Design a protein around this motif. Structure first.
Motif, PDB file in Angstrom:
ATOM      1  N   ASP A  89       0.921  -1.431   0.250  1.00 50.57           N
ATOM      2  CA  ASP A  89       0.036  -0.409   0.168  1.00 50.57           C
ATOM      3  C   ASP A  89       0.976   1.624  -0.010  1.00 50.57           C
ATOM      4  O   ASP A  89      -0.109   2.381   0.634  1.00 50.57           O
TER       5      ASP A  89
ATOM      6  N   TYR B 111      -1.853  -9.771   4.798  1.00 47.42           N
ATOM      7  CA  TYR B 111      -2.899  -9.430   3.756  1.00 47.42           C
ATOM      8  C   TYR B 111      -3.903  -9.386   3.144  1.00 47.42           C
ATOM      9  O   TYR B 111      -3.648  -8.458   2.506  1.00 47.42           O
ATOM     10  N   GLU B 112      -5.504  -9.711   4.286  1.00 48.22           N
ATOM     11  CA  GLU B 112      -5.927  -9.391   3.736  1.00 48.22           C
ATOM     12  C   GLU B 112      -6.215  -7.841   3.628  1.00 48.22           C
ATOM     13  O   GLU B 112      -7.115  -7.129   3.502  1.00 48.22           O
TER      14      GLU B 112
ATOM     15  N   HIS C 256      -4.827  -5.375   3.176  1.00 50.00           N
ATOM     16  CA  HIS C 256      -3.749  -4.612   2.106  1.00 50.00           C
ATOM     17  C   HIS C 256      -4.334  -4.889   1.048  1.00 50.00           C
ATOM     18  O   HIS C 256      -5.151  -5.830   0.248  1.00 50.00           O
ATOM     19  N   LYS C 257      -4.402  -3.584   0.295  1.00 53.09           N
ATOM     20  CA  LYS C 257      -4.678  -4.183  -1.189  1.00 53.09           C
ATOM     21  C   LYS C 257      -3.529  -4.080  -2.601  1.00 53.09           C
ATOM     22  O   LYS C 257      -3.062  -5.194  -3.387  1.00 53.09           O
TER      23      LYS C 257
ATOM     24  N   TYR D 159       0.349  -4.148  -3.364  1.00 54.72           N
ATOM     25  CA  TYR D 159       1.051  -5.356  -3.852  1.00 54.72           C
ATOM     26  C   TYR D 159       2.453  -4.720  -4.810  1.00 54.72           C
ATOM     27  O   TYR D 159       1.916  -5.395  -5.828  1.00 54.72           O
TER      28      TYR D 159
ATOM     29  N   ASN E 113      -3.560  -5.771  -7.337  1.00 46.69           N
ATOM     30  CA  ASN E 113      -4.699  -5.534  -6.272  1.00 46.69           C
ATOM     31  C   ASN E 113      -4.902  -7.274  -5.886  1.00 46.69           C
ATOM     32  O   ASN E 113      -5.278  -7.785  -6.508  1.00 46.69           O
ATOM     33  N   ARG E 114      -4.806  -7.076  -4.573  1.00 42.33           N
ATOM     34  CA  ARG E 114      -5.344  -8.281  -3.755  1.00 42.33           C
ATOM     35  C   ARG E 114      -6.885  -8.868  -4.409  1.00 42.33           C
ATOM     36  O   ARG E 114      -8.024  -7.693  -4.450  1.00 42.33           O
ATOM     37  N   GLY E 115      -7.013  -9.736  -4.897  1.00 42.65           N
ATOM     38  CA  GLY E 115      -7.989 -10.215  -4.930  1.00 42.65           C
ATOM     39  C   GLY E 115      -9.114 -10.271  -6.717  1.00 42.65           C
ATOM     40  O   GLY E 115      -8.657 -10.830  -7.635  1.00 42.65           O
ATOM     41  N   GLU E 116      -9.035  -8.913  -6.539  1.00 46.35           N
ATOM     42  CA  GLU E 116      -8.990  -8.239  -8.259  1.00 46.35           C
ATOM     43  C   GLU E 116      -8.235  -8.826  -9.406  1.00 46.35           C
ATOM     44  O   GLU E 116      -6.876  -8.930  -8.632  1.00 46.35           O
TER      45      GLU E 116
END
Lengths: 102, 219, 212
Positions: free
Chosen positions: B156, B191-192, B194-195, B197, B215-218
């Motif tokens: 982030d 990890y969850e 933040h978005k 990396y 970007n985390r997940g997306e």
């Protein structure tokens, strides 16, 4: 009485004896002789072997006898003489002729 | 004890040129029997050391004409004329005159090449790994030259320190390059939270420090 | 064929003892000298000692006295080295070598890991590709002790492959990463499988790596 080995003579094969690396070794007790071809182990066989011909007290005169050698036997020959009192080491360059001698 | 000082520690040399490794003893290596028991070895990565030269200048059976050794007493040298790709490894000098027998520190031969910029690849943690408690983010710096490269983990846009570990491969025999793997280790909960990396790559092949992100997940 | 065949990797707890063996073939073992060498990243190459198998006569480096003991099986053509009261300082690659002041013959080496930690198989995780060339790989995590072997597509894929040196994590477990750069056009057809083998725990994992 007892003493470390000494390689008092080591030369390239002569004209009269082309297939023999001559040597003279002194030592008490009888030193163990070991050869190295270009730093590698020389496994003795019926083709390349050590033979002491004259044994006069503490003096040993002999040859590294080669049977019908070719250019493939040419290189650096190291002889190491060891007993429990010391170690002597001498090296020669050998070039082998296609005939036993004159 | 006899100390064997090898100089340099790293030797950068271009393909087809000559390399010169120096070994310096603390005491004379001439034995009482008259021989100088100074030897040279090459240890290729993952392999056992191999003998190159025995007794200052004698080439061991099968060793190419390109390798040659010289010196006397305490100062000694190993020369490799027209260096090849297979010459890559660590060069060691050894003494077998005085007990205990000693080895030099080693000289790593380096093949000099034209400056190559790293290809950067960021790898998000697999869902299999997340579904066990931990999260590993992996940065990959592929085929670069020279070795000197910096990796900066940005979670982030906040600079990360201590939570990562780097690993560099030995020089490639074909393209003469290096590769780097930097892994960021943090708990799934961290990890969850933040978005963004990202990993900042600083290298002399790059004018500006390249950043690869996700970007985390997306997607 | 002069061959020095060393015994396998050993994982020993501190304070215990281990016996390392070295089978000598292709020459008359009893007629020549045998040497043992230790290799560490910090201390480099160190000479432990030497044995003359005929007389059983030894010579040791002062810093390995009481730590290492050298013996030889004459009829067996085997050299042995015992390591006593093991410490983390004893974790190294040990080599049996010969046969004179210069060492022309070396064994493959024996890795000795000195630790209380038990053997742990690895957890293999994909490094999926997200240009002309694409990078993919596998993360071999939380294993102990070293080493680990990684091949691609049962050894059929060697070009572009980079297996990184392992890192020892704060948890006391090793972590490794293996990568491969392939052409982006093959991602939709070519199957990429990393074959991971960890012998200490007798583990074999075939992990398929796919995009997304």
């Amino acid at each position: 009485v007892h003493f470390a080995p000494t390689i008092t003579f080591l030369e390239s094969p002569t004209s009269d004896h082309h297939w023999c690396i001559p040597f003279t070794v002194k030592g008490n007790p009888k030193p163990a002789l070991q050869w190295f071809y270009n730093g590698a182990i020389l496994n003795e066989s019926k083709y390349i072997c050590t033979k002491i011909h004259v044994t006069n007290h503490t003096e040993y005169h002999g040859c590294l006898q080669l049977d019908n050698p070719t250019h493939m036997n040419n290189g650096d020959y190291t002889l190491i003489a060891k007993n429990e009192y010391g170690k002597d080491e001498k090296q020669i360059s050998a070039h082998f002729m296609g005939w036993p001698g004159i | 004890d006899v100390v064997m000082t090898q100089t340099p520690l790293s030797l950068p040399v271009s393909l087809g040129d000559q390399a010169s490794i120096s070994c310096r003893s603390s005491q004379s290596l001439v034995h009482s029997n008259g021989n100088t028991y100074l030897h040279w070895y090459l240890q290729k990565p993952g392999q056992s050391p191999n003998l190159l030269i025995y007794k200052v200048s004698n080439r061991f059976s099968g060793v190419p004409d390109r390798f040659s050794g010289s010196g006397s007493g305490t100062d000694f040298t190993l020369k490799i004329s027209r260096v090849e790709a297979e010459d890559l490894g660590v060069y060691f000098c050894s003494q077998g005159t005085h007990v205990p027998y000693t080895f030099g520190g080693g000289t790593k031969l380096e093949i000099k090449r034209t400056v190559a910029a790293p290809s950067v690849f960021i790898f998000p943690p697999s869902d299999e790994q997340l579904k066990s408690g931990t999260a590993s983010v992996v940065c990959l710096l592929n085929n670069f030259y020279p070795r000197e490269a910096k990796v900066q983990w940005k979670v982030d846009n906040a600079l990360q320190s201590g939570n990562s570990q780097e690993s560099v491969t030995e020089q490639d025999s074909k393209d003469s390059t290096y590769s780097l793997s930097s892994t960021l280790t943090l708990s799934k909960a961290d990890y969850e939270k933040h978005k963004v990396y990202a990993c900042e790559v600083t290298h002399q092949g790059l004018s500006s420090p390249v950043t690869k992100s996700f970007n985390r997940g997306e997607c | 064929q002069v061959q020095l065949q060393q015994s396998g990797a050993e994982l020993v707890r501190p304070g215990a003892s281990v016996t390392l063996s070295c089978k000598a073939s292709g020459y008359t073992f009893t007629d020549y000298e045998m040497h043992w060498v230790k290799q560490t990243p910090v201390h480099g190459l160190e000479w432990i000692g030497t044995i003359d198998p005929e007389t059983a006569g030894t010579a040791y480096n002062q810093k390995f006295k009481g730590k290492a003991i050298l013996t030889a099986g004459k009829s067996s053509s085997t050299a042995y080295m015992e390591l006593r009261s093991l410490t983390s300082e004893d974790s190294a690659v040990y080599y049996c070598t010969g046969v004179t002041t210069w060492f022309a013959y070396w064994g493959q080496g024996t890795l000795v890991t000195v630790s209380a930690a038990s053997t742990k198989g690895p957890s293999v995780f994909p490094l999926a590709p997200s240009g002309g060339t694409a990078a993919l790989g596998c993360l071999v995590k939380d294993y102990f002790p070293e080493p680990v072997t990684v091949s691609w597509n049962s050894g059929a894929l060697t070009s572009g492959v980079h297996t990184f040196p392992a890192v020892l994590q704060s948890s006391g477990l090793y972590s490794l990463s293996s990568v491969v750069t392939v052409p982006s056009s093959s991602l939709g057809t070519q199957t990429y499988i990393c074959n991971v083998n960890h012998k200490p725990s007798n583990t074999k994992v075939d992990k398929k790596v796919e995009p997304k």
